[PDB]
Design a protein around this ligand. Sequence first.
Ligand code: HEM
Ligand SMILES: C[C@]12CC[C@H](O)CC1=CC[C@@H]1[C@@H]2CC[C@]2(C)C(c3cccnc3)=CC[C@@H]12
Ligand SMILES: [Hg+2]
Ligand SMILES: [Hg+2]
Ligand SMILES: [Hg+2]
Length: 406
Amino acid sequence: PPHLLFTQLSSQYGPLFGLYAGPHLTLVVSEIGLVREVLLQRGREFAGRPKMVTTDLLTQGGKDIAFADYSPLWKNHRRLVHSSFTGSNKLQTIVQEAADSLCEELQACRGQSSDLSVVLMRAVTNVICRLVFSSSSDPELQTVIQYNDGIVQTIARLKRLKECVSIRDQLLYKKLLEHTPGEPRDLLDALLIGQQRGSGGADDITEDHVLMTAAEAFGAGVETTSTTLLWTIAFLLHHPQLQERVQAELDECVGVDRPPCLSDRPHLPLLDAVLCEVMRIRPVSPILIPHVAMQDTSLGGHSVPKGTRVLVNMWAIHHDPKHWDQPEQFNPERFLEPSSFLPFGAGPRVCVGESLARIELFLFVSRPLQRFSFSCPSEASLPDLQGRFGVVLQPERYTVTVTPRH
Ligand code: HEM
Ligand SMILES: C[C@]12CC[C@H](O)CC1=CC[C@@H]1[C@@H]2CC[C@]2(C)C(c3cccnc3)=CC[C@@H]12
Ligand SMILES: [Hg+2]
Ligand SMILES: [Hg+2]
Ligand SMILES: [Hg+2]
């Protein structure tokens, strides 16, 4: 796989490669210094994204955030979303009530070598359809899960894809249509408020961008977080001792009861370190979304023509033995104290869900670990740590035994 291939080649040929496709050049960047040039130092010049056709379909031809070109239209559009992610004092609430749902379904499978994934998909999807449309067991969804899995699978291996996006677009359009500038209840509310306001176009966002942003916040919110929960628990199975310590940390500073609040984070540094280790050892995107050069620029000491694509090899920088000790190995300790670590990227294209992901990961990893304990079953393996990329780096299915405290 690309991220392993260019990681291996970096030791002996440079940390910087070039590939040619048509008449457009692609640089691969696999050294911390050079990625900070791309993402920080000269962040703005590399802030373009490419116009593929699969992404077009996904986002109605660059009407989202992640696959849209940097532009005044994009900067105001991002501002709106950012504001918005920020209150959400909210959740907490939203998260904790889904964590209770999740957590109360897990005990219903006590001593069951369940296969936790359907359960986590439903949990995170609740948090998200909720935080975006205030939507809610059930369901139409299968439908959501059904259309999400259809899109992911189509891309994993169209034709089949359009129809799947079309399902999502109509469904979302209905909730967009149905959707108080004082006290917003939804991320979609916030987006319509800001769209309302702007006299733009030309530069203010059409509402389509709302539909697309709402559609993207799903994809991103569910697929990144699901995976990070699946990875987290996978690792805590190969390392039971560490599972105990985090539980011991949780015991000592939160009760055996108090739903861990967001105000407990400074007091729970080993847990935060575990989330940061999970982020490090399995990048959700071992290669970022291509950054495109918005003008003639440079990198290393070399001119980079405008239109050049730049793949950031985040696996390489997070596994670089020059900046990490035994990066293959799993130590949240390596973060125990208070160069190369950018789990959400950096600069103008940094993750927009970073605030949310930190908060959302904390609140129901603390809680599953507060009420439950996760073990490799007797007649199963340990989970396979290699994992598979598309559309994020996720682990293969694994089976896990849950048992509560008492
Ligand atoms: C859970 C762990 C997550 C990690 C580690 C992560 C990491 C990243 C990274 C590395 C980037 C790209 C940086 C770049 O291209 O320059 C990114 C982009 C993005 N992430 Fe995340 N992300 C996570 C979760 C989420 C969530 C939950 C959302 C929900 C909305 C989200 C939305 C986005 C979006 C919209 C972008 C595109 C940013 C842009 O083009 O400016 N991410 N993320
Ligand atoms: C393809 C998918 C997931 C499947 C959806 O059906 C369509 C979709 C829309 C936006 C994509 C998302 C997966 C993760 C993506 C690719 C990304 C992301 C990836 C990792 C971390 N943060 C953000 C932001 C846009 C996100
Ligand atoms: Hg489908
Ligand atoms: Hg505490
Ligand atoms: Hg096992």
